[PDB]
Amino acid sequence: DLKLPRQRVDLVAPPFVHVHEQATKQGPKIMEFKLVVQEKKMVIDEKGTTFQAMTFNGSMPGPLMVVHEGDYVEVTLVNPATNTMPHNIDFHSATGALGGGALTLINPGEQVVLRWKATRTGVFVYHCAPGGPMIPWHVVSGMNGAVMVLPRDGLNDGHGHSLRYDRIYYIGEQDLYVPRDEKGNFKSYDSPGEAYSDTEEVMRKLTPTHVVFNGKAGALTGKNALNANVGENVLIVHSQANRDSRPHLIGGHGDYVWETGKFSNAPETGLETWFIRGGSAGAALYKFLQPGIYAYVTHNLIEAANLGATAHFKVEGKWNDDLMTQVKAPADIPTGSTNENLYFQ
Amino acid sequence: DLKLPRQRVDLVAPPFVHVHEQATKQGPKIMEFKLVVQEKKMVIDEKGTTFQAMTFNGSMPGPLMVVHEGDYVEVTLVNPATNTMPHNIDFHSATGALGGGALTLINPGEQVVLRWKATRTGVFVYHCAPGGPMIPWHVVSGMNGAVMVLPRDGLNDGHGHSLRYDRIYYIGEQDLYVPRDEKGNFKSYDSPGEAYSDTEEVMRKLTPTHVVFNGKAGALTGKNALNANVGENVLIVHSQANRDSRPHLIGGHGDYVWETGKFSNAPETGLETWFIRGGSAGAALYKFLQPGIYAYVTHNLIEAANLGATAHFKVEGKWNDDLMTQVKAPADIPTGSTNENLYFQ
Amino acid sequence: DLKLPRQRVDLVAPPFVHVHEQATKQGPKIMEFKLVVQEKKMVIDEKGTTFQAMTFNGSMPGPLMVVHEGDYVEVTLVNPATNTMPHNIDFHSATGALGGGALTLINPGEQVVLRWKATRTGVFVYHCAPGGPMIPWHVVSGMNGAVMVLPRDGLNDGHGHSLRYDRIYYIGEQDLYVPRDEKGNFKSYDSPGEAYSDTEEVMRKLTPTHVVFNGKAGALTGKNALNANVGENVLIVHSQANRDSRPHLIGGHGDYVWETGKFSNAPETGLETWFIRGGSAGAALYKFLQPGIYAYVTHNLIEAANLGATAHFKVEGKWNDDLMTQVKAPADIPTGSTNENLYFQ
Ligand SMILES: [Cu+2]
Ligand SMILES: [Cu+2]
Ligand SMILES: [Cu+2]
Ligand SMILES: [Cu+2]
Ligand SMILES: [Cu+2]
Ligand SMILES: [Cu+2]
Numbered sequence A, B, C: 001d002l003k004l005p006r007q008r009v010d011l012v013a014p015p016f017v018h019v020h021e022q023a024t025k026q027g028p029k030i031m032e033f034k035l036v037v038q039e040k041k042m043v044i045d046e047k048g049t050t051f052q053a054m055t056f057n058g059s060m061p062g063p064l065m066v067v068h069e070g071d072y073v074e075v076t077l078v079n080p081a082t083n084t085m086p087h088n089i090d091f092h093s094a095t096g097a098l099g100g101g102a103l104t105l106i107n108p109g110e111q112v113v114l115r116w117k118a119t120r121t122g123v124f125v126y127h128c129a130p131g132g133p134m135i136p137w138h139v140v141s142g143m144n145g146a147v148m149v150l151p152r153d154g155l156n157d158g159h160g161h162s163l164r165y166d167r168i169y170y171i172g173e174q175d176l177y178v179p180r181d182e183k184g185n186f187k188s189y190d191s192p193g194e195a196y197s198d199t200e201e202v203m204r205k206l207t208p209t210h211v212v213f214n215g216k217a218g219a220l221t222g223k224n225a226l227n228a229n230v231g232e233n234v235l236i237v238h239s240q241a242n243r244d245s246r247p248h249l250i251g252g253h254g255d256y257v258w259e260t261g262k263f264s265n266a267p268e269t270g271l272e273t274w275f276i277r278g279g280s281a282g283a284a285l286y287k288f289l290q291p292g293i294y295a296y297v298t299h300n301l302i303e304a305a306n307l308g309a310t311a312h313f314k315v316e317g318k319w320n321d322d323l324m325t326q327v328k329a330p331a332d333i334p335t336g337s338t339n340e341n342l343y344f345q
Helices: A097-103 A134-140 A192-204 A301-306 B097-103 B134-140 B192-204 B301-306 C097-103 C134-140 C192-204 C301-306
Strands: A006-008 A030-043 A050-056 A064-068 A072-079 A110-117 A122-127 A144-150 A167-176 A210-213 A226-229 A233-240 A247-250 A254-258 A268-271 A280-287 A292-298 A310-316 A324-332 B006-008 B030-043 B050-056 B064-068 B072-079 B110-117 B122-127 B144-150 B167-176 B210-213 B226-229 B233-240 B247-250 B254-258 B268-271 B280-287 B292-298 B310-316 B324-332 C006-008 C030-043 C050-056 C064-068 C072-079 C110-117 C122-127 C144-150 C167-176 C210-213 C226-229 C233-240 C247-250 C254-258 C268-271 C280-287 C292-298 C310-316 C324-332
Touching (some): A097 A110, A097 B247, A097 B292, A134 A167, A134 A192, A134 B301, A144 A167, A144 A233, A144 A280, A233 A247, A247 A280, A292 A301, A292 C097, A301 C192, A324 C097, B097 B110, B097 C292, B122 B233, B134 B167, B134 C301, B144 B233, B144 B280, B192 C301, B233 B247, B292 B301, C050 C192, C097 C110, C122 C233, C134 C192, C144 C167, C144 C233, C144 C280, C233 C247, C247 C280, C292 C301
Parallel strands (some): A006 A030, A030 A072, A167 A233, A226 A310, B064 B144, B167 B233, B226 B310, C030 C072, C064 C144, C167 C233
Antiparallel strands (some): A030 A050, A110 B324, A122 A280, A167 A210, A233 A280, A247 A292, A254 A280, A324 C110, B030 B050, B122 B280, B167 B210, B233 B280, B247 B292, B254 B268, B254 B280, B292 B310, C030 C050, C072 C110, C122 C144, C233 C280, C247 C292, C254 C268
């Protein structure tokens, strides 16, 4: 009855993004996606703490879906019988039935097919939402991702000029609530159900034990730093389904930032730090101007350095001494310096 | 000496709003309001927990006042002698004397009359502010509401086009700080004064025990869901006098959102989730496109589902299968499905 | 090799700001600043609680630096041998090398000279960032300030009209994490290193013990209230390097607010309360219209009244009864008043 071409999309694990066109002259299609729920224990920090997670497609965050305005998105949500709980999906991009949640509740061993029209442009959260207290628990257990609905003409600067990215990354930030024992050590559990009561108690106090990108402290540092090159315009999509965040690229800026994430609004320019409201996705474009390591953080630095929420970019290219230079390397304070006369002493 | 017509306004309890014109061709008037402080015990959650509250006009939030730009607002604040504490009022809409607080301190048995000129358009918080530590305590005990100052031409989209709402609701969100005993159960008290010391200790840790709309968990669910119809443009005013919130309409959007709440600024379009800075009111317009239940939450889902901060809309009308449809109802996973080959396993 | 004039700037302690031009017809210069790290015990509240602080130039916040777009900023960072730890500096205004942090690590007894080009307009945080867990600890110990990069034509309203301030103040807000003993009293320490382990435990819970302006509760009240006069347009720069804030001027407004702090974006008008994302600076202009005391707060009123985050302005001039007036002073409730008939009773 909807007589449009169908196109199957193969998702990829974050922070990477499946192939897509930015601008397109194709007309609306039915874009077909499959999301498979996977409940499993996962490692969430550098000390090896484990966690009873619930995911779409085995990752935290779930994968980024990319479509264009006016496409229809036909999602097969699958809940294999190796899982123990019912699940569903709420697309913040969609209109009606609790985002789809009221049409996608499935028991282990079931699947369901939801179609929603992509009438709203931007980046948007999707997440599980079974009902009642299960809603926050499934979300903070990992069941959230994002979808991007691009304008058919691609992005623009809000002032009539096209913007094109050379690279895209999806940073899903996750607040986790991990019980501790009387000795103060994180507790391990053999199933999500066994974890629940203790976890709910931590959730109620609204203070995460971990705040991570791509599912664990250190996930996007080390060998898994994000690559870029001087001159590239990089789109960084950031989502947080449950709790606020304040992204910042250390040594960079947000050249164009949609912090509320919706491309019908002009981006802000030249930001230092932006703000992702819990329950949303936002996006920032930055053209790299200097090589080296950059850290990408939430700028509650306690969260960034001590709870897990730091990623790295490794950027190749040539240093620009006009923008920044070390005029004099560290040296002993001159003996004839006069700092004892300064106003603050 | 101010020679303008006087118009008495009868307030109504939230989430409803007293009758008013959106656009008007009337000139400035003196709009007369009465607010009566009421200290009383109130029920704040579904388990029947009680709370020593302080209110304007017996409700949390206090009622929404609606005027137009250039009106004068003449408020009689009354503190009956059945109350035990002094009170005052701070209008964030007003200019001077600590919002009016420095001109309205009244003891039990007194009343005072304040007039302020509505020179600033938008939605704004009002709240009690007696002085010092009493300021946060009176506010988080319930003494806060909002006022809307409409442009005389009504709302517009920031791009020269009038916007008109068919319905308006006021959602006041309240962070509450309820002591617990050694057994972990919420404590009851016989007066606000007896509650204070234990309550201040909870306040100091900055984590509410409850986050509620219209004064209690479940207030706007059940029989008291908010009504609307497909096609109606609904204005949802949201205030929070002490603490941030991130509103979201599950299954909907914010078509036009003034998240900082001030109508001299163009609204943002097509938001998923917005942000109410503690100490402010904001507003969102949404035209309903689908019937059914919608949940309206703060999108810290722990707060929403576990601390009280969920409302419902019940929307009548006809479902639009073009926007969203269940293509296939829940069914067993096909035996010949191949999910073991998916990239994430 | 950079052949520009050099101009040495003498910094002053906050909340005051060194002398500068708003609009200028001078061309780019090399603007020379010196920042000296000082580790010392400081008093942070009205009860005399002490704290092992780390500062730039002896103050919390560090001083406001002011330059113009296209200037080069050449900073000599000095770490005297009376200090115990290494330090560095990250300018959110700068491009490359972790904001400068990767080029400025200095041991006690060393200094370094960094030059960065002021290519981005706005107010921006600067802060120490040595590496790893030392990053949040140095910041929340006090090592953060701000820099303002003005357009050469000065500020404008985003709609082609120049804005000029008569006065400028810099409000640096600081979240502090002070351990308590088993009796609940704040603990004192003899060095930052001795404080660290207990302090990190408080930091991990993400709830400050104190939230202060200009380094201590009460710093900008009393004798040190901020002065202004009716009619003056005052720029209030607000920074927070680690944690969100929601500024509000009680009895006033933000006439023009850059809450993300970047002057390539038009300001919002007529705000009640704005939002400083942790890790940023923002700015608000307000033209005073009434004399008297104003309080300037973060509008988590618990933070404002109970954790230290209130400043005052003392404004001289003549009261305007058109904007606000006490129509009737406090009086007994009339005997023939009818309040028992009101809808809420
Ligand atoms: Cu689920
Ligand atoms: Cu949601
Ligand atoms: Cu009161
Ligand atoms: Cu206020
Ligand atoms: Cu340092
Ligand atoms: Cu930083």
